[PDB]
Amino acid sequence: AVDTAEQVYISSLALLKMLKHGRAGVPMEVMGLMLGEFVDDYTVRVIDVFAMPQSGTGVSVEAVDPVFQAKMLDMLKQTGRPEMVVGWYHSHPGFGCWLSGVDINTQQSFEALSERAVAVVVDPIQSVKGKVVIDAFRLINANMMVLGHEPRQTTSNLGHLNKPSIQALIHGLNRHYYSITINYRKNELEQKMLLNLHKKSWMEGLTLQDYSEHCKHNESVVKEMLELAKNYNKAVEEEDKMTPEQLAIKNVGKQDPKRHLEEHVDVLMTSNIVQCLAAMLDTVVFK
Amino acid sequence: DKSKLKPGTRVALDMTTLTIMRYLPREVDPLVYNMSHEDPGNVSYSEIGGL
Amino acid sequence: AVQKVVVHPLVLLSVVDHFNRIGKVGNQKRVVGVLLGSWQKKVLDVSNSFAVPFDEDDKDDSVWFLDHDYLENMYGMFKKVNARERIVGWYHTGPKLHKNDIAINELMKRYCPNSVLVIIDVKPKDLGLPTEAYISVEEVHDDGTPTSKTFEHVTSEIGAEEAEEVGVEHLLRDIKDTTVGTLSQRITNQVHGLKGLNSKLLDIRSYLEKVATGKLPINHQIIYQLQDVFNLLPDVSLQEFVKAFYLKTNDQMVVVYLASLIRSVVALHNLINNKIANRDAEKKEG
Amino acid sequence: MVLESTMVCVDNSEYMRNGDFLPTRLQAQQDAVNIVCHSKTRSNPENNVGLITLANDCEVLTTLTPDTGRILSKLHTVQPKGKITFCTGIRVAHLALKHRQGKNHKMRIIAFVGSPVEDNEKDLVKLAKRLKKEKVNVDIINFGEEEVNTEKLTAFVNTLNGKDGTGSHLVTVPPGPSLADALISSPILAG
Lengths: 287, 51, 286, 191
Ligand SMILES: [Zn+2]
What we know:
This is part of a larger assembly, with chains A (about 290 residues), B (about 50 residues), C (about 290 residues) and D (about 190 residues). Chain C has about 290 residues and is of the alpha/beta class.
């Protein structure tokens, strides 16, 4: 009787912990517990996540330790705020985002204690710059398939927005477990304290970058255009011939002065414009 | 550690996501092992007469 | 001591989450915790942080509590998950470096003999970096007080790990200095640098308000540095310096000239390459 | 029982090391705690004890902890040296209660006063004033042979129990070498 609009909100901070722990044990399958709060009959939100110590050698999520669970949970409450374990996350190095046989088996354990537990898989290698790749999942009852009645009782065009990955579909996707849409919560205090902080400098603006070395860099770059320009002449006559596709493929083994010359010019103009501009700006700021 | 993984070092890799998980000593071919722990005879210099 | 302290985004975020989690009082109260990280070649790195309970009444700032057992017990938890990270210092919101945070360092001096406290504002609306890292340095003198022990600042910048950067840039998807060239430099260092210089200069002016209404009876040392600052001001731009500048400012213009000319030629050929394309297409078509 | 949590307030003043009871007022103190911490436990199998020094400033040794041996061992290496700052001493114990374990434990702190006490009244009433506001009863035990009857705390304890506020009581000991023993019975009995 799920609502196929779960929309598990994760965090602006729980994600960073998930990724950092995932990459730390990249060869293995680290596991942890999600500390979130159920809110609606339609949404489950996580707030914080804490890792569980690795049992040792072996790429598996075999079991959780009850005593460690209690000790940290009973310790976070007395300083932070109480939270209830809502799901567990384990990082798949590069396989993808799905649940294996062991992962399914460990999952029903959590569901037994809590009906709406959510399992999450984080991939720390596939995610590169703007894609994190999580795809939180949950199990489907075997009785339903035996009954044959389709689960999730779709009542909105919200869950069928992400095309399931073919790699995930090969495994028990929509057969032994169903994915739940995952979105994120972001606020200006979080964003402004991260975006306007990551790549910044204090006083590098008014620094003249080793004026002696600056012109030496210019001489080396310009001298490269002397030979580069000469090859440009030899690269214009032989062009504009038949089968330009033949010409296009003919530039797959030898440097093309058309692009190389422009690249050097681009760096040359910006380096001096900035370097020169700082000269006059400084001459007025300081005496 | 990423300092003992010099070129030529034997390294074990994971089955699913190939990733070095241990540097290993140079292997000894089983023939070479059998080529060393061989002699039970224990012949003494006093038996090879004439030479 | 330590040349610089790099603060990972995760630690920066776990401090904002800490304040909101306990800041239900609303009006005002600092929040204090324990930092974790590792350093190499005399450069510290801070990666993880956990909240240590801490309360202190405002009046008579010589009373405060920090749970040693909580610090010891929890560190056993963090040690098990990751052994590389070991206690390196402590953090507290403390926008103004409250006075009592010079005996607290002694409390944490046990776990990390050379610990660093990083003040990271939770409510920043400003232009400067919200991470000041200080280290304890000792020297007793006859001017200030018989017991002399003061913090010395260490430059701090926001770091980035391969895993964290993926999430951090995904979490923003808000604004980026795309096409990072002459556009970002003219704004990321030139205009911003001037803003910072003015604010720091304005900060000096505010302290010098003691000339009329004394706050502290002339710090002496602060004046000494200010005198040296003025002498270090670049010598008046009227002597042979002016010729040296022109002989170098103009020398940089020749390269700009040459670069622009090459740019025009390549631009002109590009137009010819394209223009002949549609003329050929049109001619064959009709 | 009744899910109580006590935060012991130990004394280590320099004049506290004279043996007018038997093994100086250092072992006399250590035996005193032993007969209370264990007595403090054994009623509800979930209690909590914490020892705090009344030395020159904020000196806290062990925090809120169900264990019993830690306090005893931590009591050693407590050689007395310096003055006692009572007024700023209880508050430090006061905060420990605020940042406690599961808050369903009743809060109380037993005092271990001793070498000549220093207070200016008035402020002490305020000191007792706040604690009596927030579900807190303190237990100052007269000890170390302060001024007879300690007529400075007398204005203190009554404030907490004022308005028929039955609770902890001030306990004194004869200046003679009266062994600590079970002599401390006013709070443990029913308060
Ligand atoms: Zn898995």
